[PDB]
From Swiss-Prot, chain A:
Job of this protein: Specifically methylates guanosine-37 in various tRNAs.
Major location category of this protein: cytoplasm
Annotated EC: 2.1.1.228
Cellular localization per UniProt: Cytoplasm
Coiled-coil intervals, chain numbering: none
UniProt-listed InterPro entries: Alpha/beta_knot_MTases, tRNA_m1G_MeTrfase_C_sf, tRNA_m1G_MeTrfase_TrmD, tRNA_m1G_MTases_N, tRNA_MeTrfase_TRMD/TRM10
A Gene Ontology BP annotation from the UniProt entry: tRNA N1-guanine methylation
Name of the molecule in the record: tRNA (guanine-N(1)-)-methyltransferase
Domain of life: Bacteria
Keyword Mitochondrion assigned: no
């Protein structure tokens, strides 16, 4: 396989959402992706120990112990074999996931994703064993399982033969253009005429202007980090004066 | 139920990740959350159950056809009953989901989440039927199913009785420690083992402030840093190598 992924989670069977459905399922079948789970409860000191314990200093919730996690990671590294496995902890305190980040992660041989639960995992585990911390965004979820599946799904799309990933939002810093399909007219709304009767340069130009315009209206910060050209400044100026 | 959620998806089986697990599963059981799926493949009139069609203007991929989506939303809106249902489309082109956004969505009685597939859904469906578009972040996924579950999970945490946070009041969370006191030559900070609530309260606030400053200074700029916090953060900064 092109990419080996090992997931450290207390709910391995949640990962059926990506292993049984979509591109990730197809990539596993096609052999582009190997997906494996490692339950920390199977690695406790003895069968009478929980993965979690009480936080030192008080406060709400439970914290995940270092020993169950350290066991699961050791066993997962062993299964990675000769691959250079990057150990990622899914955390709201990590590097914000972006398409550029997804392209970087898609070049790795192996990835060991650590899906936290409760209030989090012990800092000494992160300090010792985690290579990088990643966030899917600025919000708090109950576990790192949906974030790990978000990472895996975004990365898998970029694997050769998995799917257009070179016609997307955040590829050239722009948002995508609108998409239209049959019928030509639906509920008093017709498909733009350029898509129906325009040539491949008219379509290329209308699609670029719509992408520029949508990015300007919704995600202005995206244009600040992406210096527009003279063609684009003209197409966007036209969009602004014509949006109504 | 406190919150009714209807999901329009071609893979309703994927939603077992939230219906069988955690807080969302617990909230369904506790009756705080009603979760339902509406497969557009059931609102199609052919032998192989088609939801996709070819895009106008050319280019790669398929676009999701209106009729299957029209059907599933109509049926979902009927099931919402007398609830004020907000129709959200999960899109990388929508409003970026943040904790403040999660707090706003948690005040709604009903939500109809539209989980797209392929290259997207027809713009005329979004223009006609969708109230707001939401993104989970600046990256592209193959479908709107993981994003819809991300929304539902973040919102459910804020439902009274479902369960301070890393994006609440500006700051990121402090580090967490548990048993043993010493592991592989690494000991838990002494403040945490001491037992003085004010010492712990101030150390924890300082570590949050410090972690936010180091990693997410942007969060701090858009925050009302008190005299207590300015002092604790100044101390965090000056007392590090
Ligand atoms: N936005 C996110 N992106 C990636 N992982 C997340 C995100 N939100 C929550 N998590 C995961 O969910 C786990 C459990 C969370 N309830 C704890 C969050 C923690 N109390 C904090 O505020 O940082 C975390 O340890 C992460 O693994
Ligand atoms: N970051 C995201 N946040 C919310 N939904 C997403 C996100 N990424 C992809 N999607 C969903 O996945 C569907 C299919 C995507 N492959 C299409 C994305 C589209 N080509 C674009 O660049 O905007 C979209 O219609 C959305 O429903
Ligand atoms: Mn596209
Ligand atoms: Mn139109
Ligand atoms: Mn917290
Ligand atoms: Na035609
Ligand atoms: Na705190």
């Amino acid at each position: 396989s092109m990419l080996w992924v090992g997931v450290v989670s207390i709910f391995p069977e949640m990962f059926r959402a990506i292993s049984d459905y979509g591109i990730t399922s197809r990539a596993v079948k096609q052999g582009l992706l190997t997906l494996t789970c490692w339950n920390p409860r199977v690695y406790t000191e003895d069968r009478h120990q929980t993965v979690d314990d009480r936080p030192f200093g008080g406060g709400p919730g439970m914290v995940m112990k270092i020993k169950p996690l350290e066991g699961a990671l050791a066993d997962a590294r062993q299964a990675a074999g000769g691959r250079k496995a990057k150990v990622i902890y899914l955390s709201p305190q990590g590097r914000q996931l972006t398409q550029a980040g997804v392209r970087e992660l898609a070049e790795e041989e192996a990835l060991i994703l650590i899906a936290g639960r409760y209030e989090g995992i012990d800092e000494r585990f992160i300090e010792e064993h985690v290579d990088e911390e990643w966030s899917i965004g600025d919000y708090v979820l109950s576990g790192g399982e949906l974030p790990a599946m978000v990472l895996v799904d975004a990365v898998t799309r970029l694997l050769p033969g998995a799917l257009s990933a070179e016609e997307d939002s955040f590829t050239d810093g722009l948002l995508d253009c609108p998409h239209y399909t049959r019928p030509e007219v639906y509920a008093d709304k017709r498909v733009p005429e350029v898509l129906l009767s325009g040539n491949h340069e008219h379509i290329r130009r209308w699609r670029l202007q719509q992408a520029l315009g949508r990015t300007w209206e919704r995600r202005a910060d995206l244009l600040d980090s992406r210096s527009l050209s003279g063609e684009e400044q003209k197409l966007l100026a036209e969009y602004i004066r014509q949006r109504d």
